[PDB]
Amino acid sequence: KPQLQRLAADADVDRMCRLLEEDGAFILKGLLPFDVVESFNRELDVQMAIPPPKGERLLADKYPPHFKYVPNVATTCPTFRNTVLINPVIHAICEAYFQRTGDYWLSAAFLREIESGMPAQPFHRDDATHPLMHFQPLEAPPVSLSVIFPLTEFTEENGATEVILGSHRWTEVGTPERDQAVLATMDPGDVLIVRQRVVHAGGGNRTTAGKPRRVVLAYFNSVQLTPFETYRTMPREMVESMTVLGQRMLGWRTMKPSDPNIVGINLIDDKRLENVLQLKAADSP
Amino acid sequence: KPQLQRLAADADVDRMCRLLEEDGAFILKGLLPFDVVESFNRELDVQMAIPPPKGERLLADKYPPHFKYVPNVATTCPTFRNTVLINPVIHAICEAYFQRTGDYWLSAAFLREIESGMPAQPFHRDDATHPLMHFQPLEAPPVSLSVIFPLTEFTEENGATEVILGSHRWTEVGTPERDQAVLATMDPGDVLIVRQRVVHAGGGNRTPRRVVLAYFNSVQLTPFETYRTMPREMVESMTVLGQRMLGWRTMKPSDPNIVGINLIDDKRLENVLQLKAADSP
Numbered sequence: 001k002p003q004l005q006r007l008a009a010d011a012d013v014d015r016m017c018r019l020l021e022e023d024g025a026f027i028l029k030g031l032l033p034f035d036v037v038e039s040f041n042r043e044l045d046v047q048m049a050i051p052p053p054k055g056e057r058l059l060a061d062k063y064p065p066h067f068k069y070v071p072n073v074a075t076t077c078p079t080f081r082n083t084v085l086i087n088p089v090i091h092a093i094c095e096a097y098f099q100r101t102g103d104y105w106l107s108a109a110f111l112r113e114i115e116s117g118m119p120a121q122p123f124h125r126d127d128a129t130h131p132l133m134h135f136q137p138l139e140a141p142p143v144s145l146s147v148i149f150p151l152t153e154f155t156e157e158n159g160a161t162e163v164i165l166g167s168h169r170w171t172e173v174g175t176p177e178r179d180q181a182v183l184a185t186m187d188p189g190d191v192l193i194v195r196q197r198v199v200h201a202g203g204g205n206r207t208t209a210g211k212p213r214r215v216v217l218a219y220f221n222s223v224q225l226t227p228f229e230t231y232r233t234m235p236r237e238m239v240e241s242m243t244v245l246g247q248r249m250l251g252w253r254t255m256k257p258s259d260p261n262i263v264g265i266n267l268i269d270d271k272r273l274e275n276v277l278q279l280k281a282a283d284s285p
Numbered sequence: 286k287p288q289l290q291r292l293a294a295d296a297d298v299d300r301m302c303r304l305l306e307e308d309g310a311f312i313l314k315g316l317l318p319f320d321v322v323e324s325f326n327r328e329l330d331v332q333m334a335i336p337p338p339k340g341e342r343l344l345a346d347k348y349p350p351h352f353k354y355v356p357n358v359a360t361t362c363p364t365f366r367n368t369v370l371i372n373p374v375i376h377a378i379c380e381a382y383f384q385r386t387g388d389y390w391l392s393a394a395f396l397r398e399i400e401s402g403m404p405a406q407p408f409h410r411d412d413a414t415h416p417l418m419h420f421q422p423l424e425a426p427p428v429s430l431s432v433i434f435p436l437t438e439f440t441e442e443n444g445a446t447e448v449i450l451g452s453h454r455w456t457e458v459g460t461p462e463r464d465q466a467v468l469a470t471m472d473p474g475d476v477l478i479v480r481q482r483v484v485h486a487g488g489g490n491r492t493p494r495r496v497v498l499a500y501f502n503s504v505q506l507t508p509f510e511t512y513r514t515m516p517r518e519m520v521e522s523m524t525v526l527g528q529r530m531l532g533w534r535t536m537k538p539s540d541p542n543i544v545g546i547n548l549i550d551d552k553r554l555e556n557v558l559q560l561k562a563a564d565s566p
């Protein structure tokens with residue numbers, strides 16, 4: 001039974017892109033160093049500790065009271081914003097993956113903790129946030145990529161992600177059996193990369209009175225697709241402390257879908273947003 | 286040869302929907318009163334009279350200079366911002382048209398002025414700005430509507446929009462003959478509504494001709510023009526509907542998106558901003 005391929009972080013990017021086309025997913029081993037993972041985890045500890053907001057919680061109010069979720073970690077976790085978000089290997093993968101569609105940016109990056117006693121999810125595709133994706137044919141340029149960061153170990157017992165290899169080629173999800181999937185068992189520092197249309201399920205957490213399984217999910221989408229999370233209320237000084245790449249990911253610059261769009265997107269006064277704003281960056285004059 | 290159907294501005298919206306389904310386009314007669322057209326034209330004149338810019342012009346630099354252009358007219362034309370953008374008939378059409386797709390907003394609205402002596406555009410579908418639309422099948426919920434506001438007369442001579450009726454059902458555009466199209470001859474204040482996938486062409490101007498093109502898209506699609514640099518006092522002078530159109534509020538794609546889009550801190554954008562509107566504090 002074929003398993004998810006595990007590649008070294010410094011492996012060939014064309015190999016990675018071909019695995020996405022064939023299997024639909026793969027794992028990078030030891031992409032993030034321990035100190036970066038540990039730093040990010042402390043920042044996420046802090047956000048987990050903040051008690052539930054008083055009024056409306058748009059996503060959280062739609063799920064049961066046990067739902068553990070922290071949105072838009074880019075705005076509250078410097079290690080994500082300044083280091084993880086701009087990881088060169090992730091962007092090498094994105095550049096290759098999105099060659100046909102053009103520029104991409106961050107639609108969302110958020111935290112989940114899955115506590116002991118949670119059942120596995122049903123098999124599904126991530127095509128709900130932008131429902132138009134449901135009607136995109138297989139042969140169309142991909143518009144979404146999932147980048148999944150385990151922040152605790154992912155094990156068979158605690159709900160390692162279940163992925164059905166090659167299932168992006170299926171017409172529909174159908175009703176597959178659990179033994180058709182393989183597990184994304186991983187350690188902190190690893191990353192799981194999942195192609196659009198791949199059938200998968202969150203593994204829940206079958207441990208008894210154990211610690212929660214922690215994960216950060218980042219969705220990189222074609223700039224044609226509206227970000228779920230809008231980073232437009234971030235302080236200007238915080239945004240100007242990021243690199244150009246980081247700013248581009250968070251929607252603060254004009255971007256370019258592929259031809260036949262020959263102009264761009266996210267612009268105003270027929271000029272680039274960053275020029276209208278006179279936006280500085282950490283790595284630009 | 287069947288022509289574009291002309292409806293009264295107070296016609297039933299279900300009749301308008303049937304025409305978009307069958308023909309792919311129709312014309313509303315006298316939607317905007319003379320005084321609205323006049324004030325909008327006066328505002329556009331002011332922008333056209335201001336000296337040209339010292340730097341790159343992203344869209345304008347892609348066309349020959351007989352193509353005249355005022356971008357994102359909502360930022361400079363109060364009549365568009367306060368009256369045209371929130372027209373109840375246009376929004377009745379949009380609400381019906383996008384019932385399978387969810388919320389919609391303004392991707393772009395800009396002036397095109399075509400000087401005399403220009404030939405017509407090639408036939409095309411409006412699927413270039415968001416190329417993913419090219420791969421969306423006919424059966425999918427529509428994600429874009431083209432709304433065309435003539436600000437001068439559209440005649441057979443001066444480049445009335447050329448529209449091929451029923452062409453949304455075509456698998457591909459190819460290279461059509463001009464005689465397949467019919468003309469959207471119109472007076473200022475009329476509006477031409479064109480469904481996604483309908484093959485059409487700008488008529489150029491073979492005598493300037495003035496038109497404002499507005500593209501209302503599913504909120505799933507990133508606006509071409511971003512209105513995020515609008516002064517807060519300008520934003521708060523608009524109605525809630527206007528603010529929603531210009532990207533200043535959280536919006537709702539169709540279920541299975543049960544949450545929304547364009548939000549932060551799991552809250553509505555307008556709540557995080559504490560945004561007032563003309564018709565809601």
Ligand SMILES: [Fe+2]
Pocket residue numbers: 124125126200202
């Ligand atoms: Fe999922």
Ligand SMILES: [Fe+2]
Pocket residue numbers: 409410411485
């Ligand atoms: Fe067009």
